[PDB]
Each structure stands twice: as structure tokens, then as C-alpha cells.
Symmetry: none
Subunit: 56 residues, 10 copies
């Protein structure tokens, strides 16, 4: 499991309201969060499948 | 049918306005509701098929 | 053709702005309308194909 | 090429912010525009493929 | 690699908040940005795959 | 009183949030609404004085 | 002093961020508040002068 | 009438949401458009009066 | 010179981004700052002239 | 012509999007730029008249 999977979800400065998935280390699974649309961090997945496989 | 299927729909504190499905015990079927984007409860399905199969 | 196909489009009390299709009896075809996200009536289709097959 | 392909893009009175394609006669290709969600004119395509084939 | 891949992302005058991808020459990869919905420039991709293949 | 004074307020496809006035036939006076910045209809006044004199 | 001068400031459902003045009965003077752009109440003044004179 | 009056409106790369006027040759009058705030073309007027006098 | 002229600029909890002037005791003149739109402190002037005359 | 007229436009760290004018030495005239709202440099004019008289 990569170092970035432990980062907290980052929304960013943009005004969009898109659902993205992030790995919640404490909960042990991927959850949803609102992404602003720009300047994303590595713990930001468009696909839930990708999130679990990468940070599983 | 799981206990969580009897829970009322939970929008959450987030700003997004995404359509999700929840099981309406009183009506006997899955209906739509607006999900905020974060902190979802279990009675929250992205797919209607999933909702009717799980709480059917 | 079901009697609900003659009902006018219902947006509902919710804040979302989703495109849904409804059958316009006067025009003879399905058209688009903005669905609020909750408490939908029968003349509300996610798919245009479904709308024109059901109320065709 | 149908004459409606020469119409200017019509957003309509509705509140939604949907991307639709319209044929730009001057530019010679289909471009994007924001559709309101209701009362669409003919030069309004959900699919870019459809737009280019119809007004190509 | 086409010259347009070096252009900065262009949101445009429209109200929509759509996620599109653009090539960030400095970073060496495609990133997300909010597209307004109309009058797009060339460094604007609907698909991330397309962005990377074109400006890779 | 011109026929256009009976039209509903039209925000348009643009991103700006400008206050403009429109004549509300039902209420009998001019009210405010948010204009997007482009492709305005006739029932759109920069000045409240103008609105009331034209559609009074 | 009119009855409406005792109403609390109303922002409304619109997305603009305009400065308007309202009479604060408790403080004894007009103060600023953010008006959304539509569906205003009577305790909403564009001009501070007007606010004090009307509810003074 | 100067030839720049035939140019299409240019918003520019900047983030602001300012209303400016441009001459619409096809319509025969000045209309509004959203200016980004920097790198303005010639067909960009702060004043509507100026626009109609210059490109009238 | 009033005591309040020595206070630091107060943006407040509101969403607007209005330019206001405040007296900078250290610099010896009025400067600009972003006011949120509500709950303003005394070192907040709409007019620069007023700021320099009051705290001059 | 003052030495500050040769400085490049400074937006600053603030979130506002105000149009200000700056002298472009290379172009020989004042142009527009987006000012953030705080910590302005000398080549920043609220009025275009002022800009061209000071750095003319």
C-alpha cells in the first residue's frame, strides 16, 4: 500500500462538485468525497474499483 | 432483508446533489434521493439494481 | 398507452437538476425536463428509449 | 444537410447546466453549448457523433 | 506533440462545471480543470486517454 | 405595455452573476434576477427606473 | 417606522453575492448583508441612505 | 465602421466575470459578453454608448 | 485619530469578496482588503476618501 | 514617468477578482488585469484615466 493512500481527501480550490473516492486508512476502505475539479492529490480516484485495488 | 434497509435516506453535510437510491420500506421499493457526496449511510445505492436485490 | 403518460412533468421539491424524459401527449413524443431528485411521478424516465417504448 | 443545422444554439428557460452539441455552420463543425434542460430546438445533440453525421 | 498542448486550460464564459483534461507541459501529464461548457480551446479533452495519447 | 414584459426572466448560458431587473406581470412590478452575462432577452433591464417606465 | 423594518435579513435562493443593507432593530441602525439576487423581502435596500430614512 | 467591429467576442484566459459589450455584426447592435479581465481584443467596450457610436 | 483605526482588518464570516479600505497604522495610510459582506468592524470604509479623513 | 510604471502587474494573495489597470511599458498604454484585493503594488490603478496620466 502506497504512502499517498494515508493522505486526507483534498477538495481543492475549484467550484465543481464531483464525487471521487479516497482511501480512509482508519476505516479500512474507500469512501466518497467532493472534489472541486482541479489540483487533485494522489488519494483521489474516479473509480471505486481502482481505489480498493491500489490502496487495498 | 438487512436491518439498514429500514433506515431513512441520509443526504449528509456535503454540497453535491447526486441522485442515489434508497429502500423505502413503507412503499416496498427503491426510490431516489439527493446525496450530498460524503458520509453516506448504508441505505444508499449508486445502482437501482443493487438496491432492489439487496433490500428486495 | 398507460394513463400516467398523460400526466404533466413533475420536478418535485428537491434541489438537484437532472435531465429526465416525459411523454408529451400533445406533441406525440418524449421530451426533456428538469427533475429535482426526489418524489418522482410515473411520467419520468431516465432513458429516452424506455419513455418512447412505454408511452409510444 | 437539414436546414435546422443552421439554427443558433438555444439554451432554453430551464435551470440545468448540461453540455450538448450544436452544428456551427460558420466553423464547419459541431461545438459544445450549455442546454438548460427543457424546450430544446432541433440543433441540439446529446451525442457528438450524431451531430456530425446529421449536419456533416 | 502538437503546439496546442502547451496552451493553458481555458474555462470559457459559460456557467457549467464540467471536468475536462488538459496537458500540463510543466508537470508532464494530463490534469483536470473545470470547463464552462462553450468556446473550448484545443487543450481540452473529454477523455483522459485521448489527452495522454495526443500530447504524450 | 409591450408583449415582452410578460416573458419570464432569462439567465442565459454564461457564468457571471449580475443583478438585472425584470417585470413580473403577476406581482405588478419589477424584481431582481441573476443574469449570466450573455444572450439576454428583452425582459432584462440594467436600470430599475427603465424597467418600471417601459413595463409600467 | 414600517412593520417590515423588523424582519430579519433574507438572502434568498440565488447564487449572487451582492451587498445590501437591512435595518437591525436591536442595533438601531442599518447594516450590511449578502443578498442572493432574487426573491427579496422589504428589508433590503440597495442604498444605505434609503435604509436609514425609511426605517429611521 | 472599423474592421475590428467584425471580430467575435474574446473572453480571455483570466478568471473575472465582467460584463462588456461587443458589436454583433449579424444582429446589427451591441450585445453583452463575459470578459475574463485580461488580454482584451478591440471589440470590447466598457460602455454601451461607446460601442454603438464606434461600430454604429 | 479614533482608537478603532488601529484595529486589524476584519473580513467576517460571509461569502462576498468586496474591496473595502482600512487604516494601516504601521504604514500610515489606508489600504485595501477583502470584506466578506457582513458583521463589519469599524476599521472598514467603502470610500478611500472617508478612510483617510477619519484616520488621517 | 515614475519607475514603478515599469513593474509587472501584481494580483496578490487575495481571493477577489477586481479589474484594475496597469501600465504596459512594452505596449505603451494601460491595460487591464485581475487584482486579488490586497497588498497592491504601485502599478495598480482603479481609474484608467489616472493610469495613462501618471505613466503617460
Amino acid at each position: 500500500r502506497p504512502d499517498f493512500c494515508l493522505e486526507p481527501p483534498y477538495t481543492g480550490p475549484c467550484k465543481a462538485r464531483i464525487i471521487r473516492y479516497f482511501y480512509n486508512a482508519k476505516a479500512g476502505l474507500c469512501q466518497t468525497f467532493v472534489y472541486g475539479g482541479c489540483r487533485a492529490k494522489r488519494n483521489n480516484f474516479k473509480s471505486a474499483e481502482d481505489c480498493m485495488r491500489t490502496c487495498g
